[PDB]
C-alpha cells in the first residue's frame, strides 16, 4: 500500500488577456499550494476501483469521469500494464471548492502508482503525463509556488524565504468559469475594469517571505466579473479584511476567497470571525507554500 499527500491550490495572481478567437483568453497566473490536502492510498487489486471519503465525497463519480480514475489508466498505459489498482481518496480539499481538488487527486495517483509499482519514472515524466490529464494537474505535482506564463508552458519554480498564512472561505454554490469569462468580456466592453500589475513584483514578495509586501500585489482580473455576478463576494472580502486579514481576493473564477494574514495567530482569529459571521459555507486556515504530491506512507 502507498499513500500520497497532495495540496489544493490558490491563484495569487491572475492576468487575463483580451478575448481573441476562437474566443480564447491568454493567461498568466501565479499558483500557490496550501495545506488543505487530499491523501490518496493505492493498493494492488484485481481490477481498477475508486472510492472517496470526506465531506463532499458522496457527490463525486467513482468511474472514468473522475480524473483520478483517468490518471490510473494513463499511468498504466504509459508502461504497458492494466490499471489493476484500488484507489482510496481521503478528501479534505473542499468539493467543488475551486482549489483543483480533482487535479490534486490525479497527480497523487500518478505518484502513488509510480511508487507502488516500483517504476520510479522521473518526476518530469509524471508532469508530462499530468499535462495530458488537465491544466491544473502539473501544478499539483509541482507544489510550492509557481509562475505559469501560458497554456503549454513549463511551470517556473518560486521558492519562499518564509511560510505564509491563509484563511480560505468557500461558498455553498460555485460560479461557472464560462459565465465569469462572459461577464469579464462584457465589463471590458462597457467600461475599464481593474488591470493587474506585472508578475515580477509578486514573485519578489513571495521570495522575500514578506506578507506585508505581498498583500497589495495579490490580484485576480476575474474578480471584478465574479463580484459583478454576485455582489455578496465583495462584502465577504471586506469582512475578512475588517476581521484583520492583510488582503483578500477571490481565487480563480470564484466564488472561493483567499485571505492573506500576518501569522498563524491572526489567521485563526480572522477565520473564527468569518466563520461566526456566517458569510460563507466553510472557513479553514492553511499555510503555504507546501510541497506537491508526495509519498507519505509506504
Amino acid at each position: 500500500s502507498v499513500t500520497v499527500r497532495v495540496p489544493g491550490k490558490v491563484n495569487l495572481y491572475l492576468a487575463v488577456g483580451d478575448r481573441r478567437e476562437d474566443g480564447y483568453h491568454e493567461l498568466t497566473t501565479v499558483f500557490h499550494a496550501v495545506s488543505l490536502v487530499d491523501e490518496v492510498t493505492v493498493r494492488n487489486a484485481d481490477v481498477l476501483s475508486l472510492e472517496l471519503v470526506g465531506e463532499g465525497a458522496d457527490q463525486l463519480p467513482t468511474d472514468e469521469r473522475n480524473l483520478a480514475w483517468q490518471a490510473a489508466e494513463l499511468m498504466a498505459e504509459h508502461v504497458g500494464r492494466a490499471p489493476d489498482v484500488s484507489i482510496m481518496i481521503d478528501k479534505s480539499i473542499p468539493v467543488a471548492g475551486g482549489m483543483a481538488g480533482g487535479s490534486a487527486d490525479a497527480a497523487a495517483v500518478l505518484v502513488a502508482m509510480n511508487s507502488l509499482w516500483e517504476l520510479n519514472v522521473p518526476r518530469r515524466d509524471l508532469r508530462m503525463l499530468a499535462a495530458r490529464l488537465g491544466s491544473d494537474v502539473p501544478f499539483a505535482l509541482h507544489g510550492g509556488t509557481a509562475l505559469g506564463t501560458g497554456r503549454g508552458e513549463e511551470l517556473a519554480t518560486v521558492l519562499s524565504r518564509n511560510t505564509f498564512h491563509w484563511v480560505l472561505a468557500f461558498a455553498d454554490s460555485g460560479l461557472l468559469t464560462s459565465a465569469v469569462y462572459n461577464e469579464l468580456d462584457r465589463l471590458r466592453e462597457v467600461g475599464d475594469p481593474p488591470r493587474l500589475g506585472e508578475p515580477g513584483p509578486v514573485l519578489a514578495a513571495l521570495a522575500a517571505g514578506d506578507p506585508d509586501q505581498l498583500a497589495p500585489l495579490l490580484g485576480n482580473e476575474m474578480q471584478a466579473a465574479a463580484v459583478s455576478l454576485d455582489p455578496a463576494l465583495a462584502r465577504a472580502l471586506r469582512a475578512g479584511v475588517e476581521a484583520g486579514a492583510l488582503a483578500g481576493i477571490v481565487s480563480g473564477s470564484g466564488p472561493t476567497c483567499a485571505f492573506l494574514c500576518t501569522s498563524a495567530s491572526s489567521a485563526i482569529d480572522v477565520g473564527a470571525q468569518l466563520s461566526g459571521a456566517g458569510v460563507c459555507r466553510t472557513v479553514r486556515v492553511a499555510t503555504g507554500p507546501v510541497p506537491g504530491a508526495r509519498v507519505v506512507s509506504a
Side-chain angles (χ1 to χ4, degrees), residues 163-194:
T163 300
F164 299 88
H165 298 271
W166 297 101
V167 172
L168 284 340
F170 306 86
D172 37 42
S173 99
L175 258 184
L176 294 175
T177 64
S178 168
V180 168
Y181 272 123
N182 291 341
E183 180 62 6
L184 173 58
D185 291 348
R186 189 208 140 245
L187 286 180
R188 281 166 171 183
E189 201 166 321
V190 76
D192 165 53

Short mmCIF file of all heavy atoms in Angstrom, two decimals, residues 163-194:
data_model
loop_
_atom_site.label_atom_id
_atom_site.label_comp_id
_atom_site.label_asym_id
_atom_site.label_seq_id
_atom_site.Cartn_x
_atom_site.Cartn_y
_atom_site.Cartn_z
N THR A 163 7.11 30.91 5.48
CA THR A 163 5.74 30.44 5.37
C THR A 163 4.76 31.61 5.32
O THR A 163 4.96 32.60 6.02
CB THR A 163 5.40 29.65 6.65
OG1 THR A 163 6.31 28.54 6.77
CG2 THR A 163 3.96 29.16 6.64
N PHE A 164 3.71 31.50 4.51
CA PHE A 164 2.59 32.45 4.56
C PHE A 164 1.32 31.83 5.18
O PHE A 164 1.12 30.62 5.12
CB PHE A 164 2.24 32.94 3.17
CG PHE A 164 3.36 33.68 2.51
CD1 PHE A 164 4.30 33.00 1.76
CD2 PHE A 164 3.46 35.05 2.63
CE1 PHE A 164 5.34 33.69 1.13
CE2 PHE A 164 4.49 35.76 2.01
CZ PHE A 164 5.43 35.07 1.26
N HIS A 165 0.47 32.68 5.74
CA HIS A 165 -0.73 32.20 6.44
C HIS A 165 -2.00 32.69 5.80
O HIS A 165 -2.13 33.88 5.49
CB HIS A 165 -0.67 32.59 7.89
CG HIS A 165 0.49 31.97 8.60
ND1 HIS A 165 0.40 30.73 9.20
CD2 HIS A 165 1.77 32.38 8.74
CE1 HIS A 165 1.58 30.42 9.71
NE2 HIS A 165 2.43 31.39 9.44
N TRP A 166 -2.92 31.76 5.61
CA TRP A 166 -4.10 31.98 4.81
C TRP A 166 -5.38 31.65 5.56
O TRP A 166 -5.40 30.74 6.38
CB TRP A 166 -4.04 31.11 3.58
CG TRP A 166 -2.89 31.45 2.69
CD1 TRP A 166 -1.70 30.77 2.59
CD2 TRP A 166 -2.81 32.54 1.77
NE1 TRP A 166 -0.88 31.39 1.66
CE2 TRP A 166 -1.55 32.47 1.14
CE3 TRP A 166 -3.70 33.56 1.42
CZ2 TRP A 166 -1.15 33.40 0.17
CZ3 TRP A 166 -3.30 34.48 0.46
CH2 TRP A 166 -2.04 34.40 -0.15
N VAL A 167 -6.44 32.38 5.26
CA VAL A 167 -7.79 31.91 5.54
C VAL A 167 -8.45 31.66 4.20
O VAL A 167 -8.41 32.54 3.32
CB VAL A 167 -8.61 32.93 6.35
CG1 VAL A 167 -10.09 32.48 6.45
CG2 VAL A 167 -8.01 33.12 7.75
N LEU A 168 -9.03 30.47 4.03
CA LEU A 168 -9.76 30.14 2.80
C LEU A 168 -11.24 30.02 3.15
O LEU A 168 -11.58 29.35 4.12
CB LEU A 168 -9.29 28.82 2.20
CG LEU A 168 -7.97 28.70 1.41
CD1 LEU A 168 -7.51 30.06 0.92
CD2 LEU A 168 -6.89 28.06 2.24
N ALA A 169 -12.10 30.67 2.38
CA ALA A 169 -13.53 30.63 2.63
C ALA A 169 -14.31 30.25 1.37
O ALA A 169 -14.05 30.74 0.26
CB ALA A 169 -14.03 31.96 3.21
N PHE A 170 -15.29 29.37 1.56
CA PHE A 170 -15.96 28.71 0.46
C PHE A 170 -17.45 29.02 0.51
O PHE A 170 -18.02 29.13 1.58
CB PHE A 170 -15.72 27.20 0.54
CG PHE A 170 -14.27 26.82 0.62
CD1 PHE A 170 -13.62 26.78 1.84
CD2 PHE A 170 -13.53 26.55 -0.54
CE1 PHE A 170 -12.28 26.45 1.92
CE2 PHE A 170 -12.21 26.22 -0.47
CZ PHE A 170 -11.57 26.17 0.76
N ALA A 171 -18.06 29.15 -0.67
CA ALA A 171 -19.50 29.40 -0.78
C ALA A 171 -20.25 28.08 -0.92
O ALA A 171 -19.64 27.02 -1.08
CB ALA A 171 -19.79 30.31 -1.96
N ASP A 172 -21.57 28.14 -0.87
CA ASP A 172 -22.40 26.93 -0.96
C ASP A 172 -22.70 26.53 -2.40
O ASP A 172 -23.23 25.44 -2.66
CB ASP A 172 -23.69 27.14 -0.18
CG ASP A 172 -24.20 28.54 -0.31
OD1 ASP A 172 -24.14 29.07 -1.44
OD2 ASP A 172 -24.64 29.12 0.71
N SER A 173 -22.37 27.41 -3.34
CA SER A 173 -22.56 27.12 -4.75
C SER A 173 -21.39 27.74 -5.49
O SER A 173 -20.80 28.72 -5.03
CB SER A 173 -23.86 27.73 -5.27
OG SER A 173 -23.62 28.96 -5.93
N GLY A 174 -21.06 27.16 -6.64
CA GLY A 174 -19.96 27.67 -7.44
C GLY A 174 -20.36 28.80 -8.37
O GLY A 174 -21.49 29.29 -8.33
N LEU A 175 -19.42 29.22 -9.20
CA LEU A 175 -19.68 30.19 -10.25
C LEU A 175 -19.04 29.64 -11.51
O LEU A 175 -17.83 29.48 -11.54
CB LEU A 175 -19.02 31.52 -9.92
CG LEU A 175 -19.89 32.64 -9.38
CD1 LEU A 175 -19.05 33.91 -9.22
CD2 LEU A 175 -21.10 32.86 -10.28
N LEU A 176 -19.84 29.38 -12.53
CA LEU A 176 -19.32 28.82 -13.77
C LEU A 176 -18.19 29.69 -14.36
O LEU A 176 -18.35 30.91 -14.52
CB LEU A 176 -20.46 28.65 -14.79
CG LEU A 176 -21.53 27.61 -14.42
CD1 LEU A 176 -22.66 27.61 -15.44
CD2 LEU A 176 -20.91 26.21 -14.30
N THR A 177 -17.06 29.08 -14.69
CA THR A 177 -15.97 29.85 -15.29
C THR A 177 -16.44 30.50 -16.60
O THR A 177 -16.17 31.67 -16.87
CB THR A 177 -14.71 28.99 -15.51
OG1 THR A 177 -15.00 27.96 -16.47
CG2 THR A 177 -14.28 28.35 -14.21
N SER A 178 -17.18 29.74 -17.40
CA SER A 178 -17.76 30.26 -18.62
C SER A 178 -18.53 31.56 -18.39
O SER A 178 -18.32 32.55 -19.10
CB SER A 178 -18.71 29.23 -19.22
OG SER A 178 -19.48 29.83 -20.24
N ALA A 179 -19.40 31.57 -17.39
CA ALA A 179 -20.22 32.75 -17.10
C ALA A 179 -19.35 33.91 -16.61
O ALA A 179 -19.64 35.07 -16.87
CB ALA A 179 -21.30 32.42 -16.09
N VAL A 180 -18.27 33.60 -15.91
CA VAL A 180 -17.41 34.64 -15.39
C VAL A 180 -16.60 35.29 -16.53
O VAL A 180 -16.47 36.52 -16.58
CB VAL A 180 -16.49 34.12 -14.25
CG1 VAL A 180 -15.40 35.14 -13.90
CG2 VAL A 180 -17.33 33.76 -13.00
N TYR A 181 -16.07 34.48 -17.44
CA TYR A 181 -15.40 35.00 -18.63
C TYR A 181 -16.31 35.91 -19.45
O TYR A 181 -15.88 36.95 -19.95
CB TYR A 181 -14.89 33.87 -19.52
CG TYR A 181 -13.50 33.35 -19.20
CD1 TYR A 181 -13.30 32.01 -18.92
CD2 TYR A 181 -12.40 34.20 -19.18
CE1 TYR A 181 -12.04 31.51 -18.63
CE2 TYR A 181 -11.13 33.71 -18.89
CZ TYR A 181 -10.96 32.36 -18.62
OH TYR A 181 -9.72 31.86 -18.33
N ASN A 182 -17.57 35.50 -19.62
CA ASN A 182 -18.52 36.30 -20.39
C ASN A 182 -18.72 37.67 -19.76
O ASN A 182 -18.75 38.69 -20.45
CB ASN A 182 -19.85 35.56 -20.55
CG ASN A 182 -19.74 34.34 -21.45
OD1 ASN A 182 -18.79 34.22 -22.23
ND2 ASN A 182 -20.70 33.42 -21.35
N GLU A 183 -18.83 37.68 -18.44
CA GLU A 183 -19.05 38.92 -17.73
C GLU A 183 -17.80 39.81 -17.77
O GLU A 183 -17.90 41.03 -17.82
CB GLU A 183 -19.49 38.63 -16.29
CG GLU A 183 -19.75 39.87 -15.43
CD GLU A 183 -20.89 40.75 -15.96
OE1 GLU A 183 -21.58 40.38 -16.94
OE2 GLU A 183 -21.10 41.84 -15.39
N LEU A 184 -16.62 39.20 -17.73
CA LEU A 184 -15.39 39.97 -17.79
C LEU A 184 -15.30 40.66 -19.16
O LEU A 184 -15.00 41.84 -19.25
CB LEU A 184 -14.17 39.08 -17.54
CG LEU A 184 -12.81 39.76 -17.75
CD1 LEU A 184 -12.65 40.99 -16.84
CD2 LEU A 184 -11.64 38.77 -17.58
N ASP A 185 -15.57 39.91 -20.23
CA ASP A 185 -15.62 40.48 -21.58
C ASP A 185 -16.59 41.65 -21.61
O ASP A 185 -16.27 42.72 -22.11
CB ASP A 185 -16.08 39.43 -22.60
CG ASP A 185 -15.04 38.34 -22.82
OD1 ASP A 185 -13.89 38.52 -22.36
OD2 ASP A 185 -15.38 37.32 -23.46
N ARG A 186 -17.77 41.43 -21.05
CA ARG A 186 -18.79 42.45 -21.07
C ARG A 186 -18.30 43.68 -20.31
O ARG A 186 -18.46 44.81 -20.77
CB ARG A 186 -20.09 41.90 -20.48
CG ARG A 186 -21.29 42.82 -20.65
CD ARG A 186 -22.33 42.60 -19.54
NE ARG A 186 -22.83 43.91 -19.15
CZ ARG A 186 -22.66 44.47 -17.96
NH1 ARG A 186 -22.04 43.81 -16.99
NH2 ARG A 186 -23.14 45.68 -17.74
N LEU A 187 -17.69 43.46 -19.16
CA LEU A 187 -17.22 44.57 -18.33
C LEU A 187 -16.14 45.38 -19.04
O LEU A 187 -16.04 46.58 -18.85
CB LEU A 187 -16.71 44.07 -16.97
CG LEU A 187 -17.77 43.63 -15.95
CD1 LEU A 187 -17.09 43.16 -14.67
CD2 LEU A 187 -18.76 44.75 -15.64
N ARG A 188 -15.35 44.69 -19.87
CA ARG A 188 -14.28 45.34 -20.64
C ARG A 188 -14.84 46.13 -21.83
O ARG A 188 -14.21 47.08 -22.30
CB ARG A 188 -13.24 44.30 -21.10
CG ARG A 188 -12.25 43.91 -19.98
CD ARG A 188 -11.46 42.66 -20.30
NE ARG A 188 -10.40 42.46 -19.31
CZ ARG A 188 -9.50 41.49 -19.36
NH1 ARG A 188 -9.51 40.61 -20.35
NH2 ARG A 188 -8.57 41.40 -18.41
N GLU A 189 -16.02 45.74 -22.30
CA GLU A 189 -16.68 46.44 -23.40
C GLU A 189 -17.36 47.71 -22.91
O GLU A 189 -17.14 48.78 -23.45
CB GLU A 189 -17.68 45.52 -24.09
CG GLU A 189 -18.04 45.93 -25.51
CD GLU A 189 -18.76 44.83 -26.26
OE1 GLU A 189 -18.39 43.64 -26.09
OE2 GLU A 189 -19.70 45.13 -27.03
N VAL A 190 -18.17 47.59 -21.86
CA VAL A 190 -18.91 48.74 -21.35
C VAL A 190 -18.05 49.68 -20.50
O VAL A 190 -18.44 50.81 -20.22
CB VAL A 190 -20.19 48.32 -20.57
CG1 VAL A 190 -19.83 47.78 -19.19
CG2 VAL A 190 -21.16 49.48 -20.46
N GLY A 191 -16.87 49.22 -20.09
CA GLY A 191 -16.04 50.01 -19.20
C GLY A 191 -14.57 49.65 -19.19
O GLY A 191 -14.02 49.18 -20.19
N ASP A 192 -13.93 49.89 -18.06
CA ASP A 192 -12.50 49.63 -17.93
C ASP A 192 -12.18 49.06 -16.54
O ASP A 192 -11.70 49.78 -15.67
CB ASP A 192 -11.70 50.91 -18.19
CG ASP A 192 -10.27 50.82 -17.72
OD1 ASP A 192 -9.56 49.86 -18.11
OD2 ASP A 192 -9.84 51.71 -16.96
N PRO A 193 -12.48 47.77 -16.33
CA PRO A 193 -12.23 47.12 -15.04
C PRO A 193 -10.73 47.07 -14.72
O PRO A 193 -9.90 47.17 -15.63
CB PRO A 193 -12.79 45.70 -15.25
CG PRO A 193 -12.78 45.52 -16.76
CD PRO A 193 -13.19 46.87 -17.26
N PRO A 194 -10.38 46.90 -13.43
CA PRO A 194 -9.00 46.99 -12.93
C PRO A 194 -8.07 46.00 -13.61
O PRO A 194 -8.40 44.82 -13.70
CB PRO A 194 -9.14 46.63 -11.45
CG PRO A 194 -10.37 45.79 -11.38
CD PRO A 194 -11.30 46.34 -12.42
#
